[PDB]
């Protein structure tokens, strides 16, 4: 539904997925990083009912669903559910088919390599995106905040990476990764 072949941006956290197009100041829509599945035996015939629900569908029908998060502490392990979320996100609600738009994804610098590799593989092989770029949260946070220099303490849902940047340069020896995030605060 867009009138320009801008890049797409999709911030796939362990909590929620914020997505929209590049050049804007906000995601156009926010979806949970969830694929839901029924935990009950169907009783009635001709009720429709999906084998799995995606994003906002998973929360909307959650009364009888178990809701799973494909991403654990920032890393995707269930790529199949990620593909479902992305297809819904890009084609049904954001109305941007990746085939016609380059796509940028986000991740902690110490997020294990499989995350950036699998996300890149899926956008190129199941979505046919013309181009890809996996960006680092510390970089992204300083740009959003109007800084080139500072400490990015991302107290997000998954893992906190705590990464210092000076004059645009990484200072990797000073990174303190902490296994504490919003999901644990909720559990407490």
């Amino acid at each position: 539904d867009e009138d320009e072949t801008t890049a797409l941006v999709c911030d796939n956290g362990s909590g929620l997925v914020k997505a929209g197009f590049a050049g804007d100041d906000a995601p156009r829509a926010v979806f949970p990083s969830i694929v839901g599945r029924p935990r009950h035996q169907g009783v009635m015939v001709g009720m429709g009912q999906k084998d799995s629900y995606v994003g906002d569908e998973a929360q909307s029908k959650r009364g009888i669903l178990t809701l799973k998060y494909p991403i654990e502490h920032g890393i995707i392990t269930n790529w199949d559910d990620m593909e479902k979320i992305w297809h819904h996100t890009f084609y049904n609600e954001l109305r941007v088919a990746p085939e016609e738009h380059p796509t940028l994804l986000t991740e902690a610098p110490l997020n294990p390599k499989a995350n950036r590799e699998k996300m890149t593989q899926i956008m190129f092989e199941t979505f046919n995106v013309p181009a890809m770029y996996v960006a680092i949260q510390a970089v992204l946070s300083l740009y959003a905040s109007g800084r080139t220099t500072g400490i990015v303490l991302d107290s997000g849902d998954g893992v906190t990476h705590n990464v210092p940047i000076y004059e645009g340069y990484a200072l990797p020896h000073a990174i303190m990764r902490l296994d504490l995030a919003g999901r644990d605060l909720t559990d407490y």
């Binding site: 050049g23 100041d25 740009y143 959003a144 109007g146």
Partner: protein, 56 residues
């Protein structure tokens, strides 16, 4: 008997005066680099809102 002390004290003064006059002539002839500059500031008092950049 005093002719030489006069001449010797004078030779010392003429040389010292020469050497000092040479460094004084340049000291007095040009003096801008030996001074200072305003070194002003920005303040941004006209910053009534956000900028056109995606970063603002």
């Amino acid at each position: 008997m005093q002719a030489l002390l006069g001449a010797r004290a004078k030779e010392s003064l003429d040389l010292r005066a020469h050497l000092k006059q040479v460094k004084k002539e340049d000291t007095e002839k040009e003096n801008r680099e030996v001074g200072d500059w305003r070194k002003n500031i920005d303040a941004l008092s006209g910053m009534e809102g956000r900028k056109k950049k995606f970063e603002s």
